Symmetry: C4
Subunit: 82 residues, 4 copies
Amino acid sequence: VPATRILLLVLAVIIYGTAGFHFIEGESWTVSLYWTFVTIATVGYGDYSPRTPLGMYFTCTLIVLGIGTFAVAVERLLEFLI
Amino acid sequence: VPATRILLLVLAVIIYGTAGFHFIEGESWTVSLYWTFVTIATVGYGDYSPRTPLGMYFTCTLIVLGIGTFAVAVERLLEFLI
Amino acid sequence: VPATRILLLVLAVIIYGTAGFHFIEGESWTVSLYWTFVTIATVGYGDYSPRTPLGMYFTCTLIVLGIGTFAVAVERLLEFLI
Amino acid sequence: VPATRILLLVLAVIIYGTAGFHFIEGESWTVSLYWTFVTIATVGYGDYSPRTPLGMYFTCTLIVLGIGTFAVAVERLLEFLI
Ligand SMILES: [K+]
Ligand SMILES: [K+]
Ligand SMILES: [K+]
Ligand SMILES: [K+]
Ligand SMILES: [K+]
């Protein structure tokens, strides 16, 4: 699968996660972007996390849609850097 | 291994984790489902975590049974979405 | 690599992590075992974490020695269960 | 890719993450090294995490540059130990 397509897919995940956290959980755009990376990378510091049932359901969807996409993106980036 | 079988396996893990956390640690069904996804995806925010020895042992079993199952499920989903 | 050998390797990691956390950080044997699984699986709730410089260095060694070993163990277990 | 080259790459990531956290977030060199391992391994305890917008952006860059590099390093180490 072309590297650039994987890039677009991970960008779409990032937009989805950031806007979702911002609107559902009410955190700033910057915090929401940071939380999205931390979540889809599976780092999960827990400095930010959803507090609402909708936010919890949303987070599960982001986990399912985002962790695999991010994993493929990082491995494709590895190839270009290495 | 057929994608639908992997789906059933991950659903079984989700049921096991959710019911276990709910009954052992006493959190709501929704929180317990959320905690199960967060745990088997290895995100591990730590907003919820077991506080009892039984809950700790149970969590180790969920980790062993669930992380691999979830990993295979997400990669199979990737194929269908990509 | 034989599945049983991978089993022994992950058990050795578990012993190393549990005894190390118990003696360096002073937590109970049960908490230390739980923390070891949570760490080598990369779940990392953060309900327990090292507070001392020695504990921090030790945790880095466990991360390096344990995450790969655990990953191989879970995938080998997948095969037997599936 | 030669194992020793992967070693140098992961060391470079470790230096980048440690110095960055130390200077941006103001934590000690030891805490910063520990946080770097915890982050690139995706353990993410959350005992330490960035509190500033710059630190958040920096952490996202470390996540992208470091998680894949660390993953390849651990698997290469597995081979030598096994
Ligand atoms: K984690
Ligand atoms: K955490
Ligand atoms: K993998
Ligand atoms: K993780
Ligand atoms: K975590």
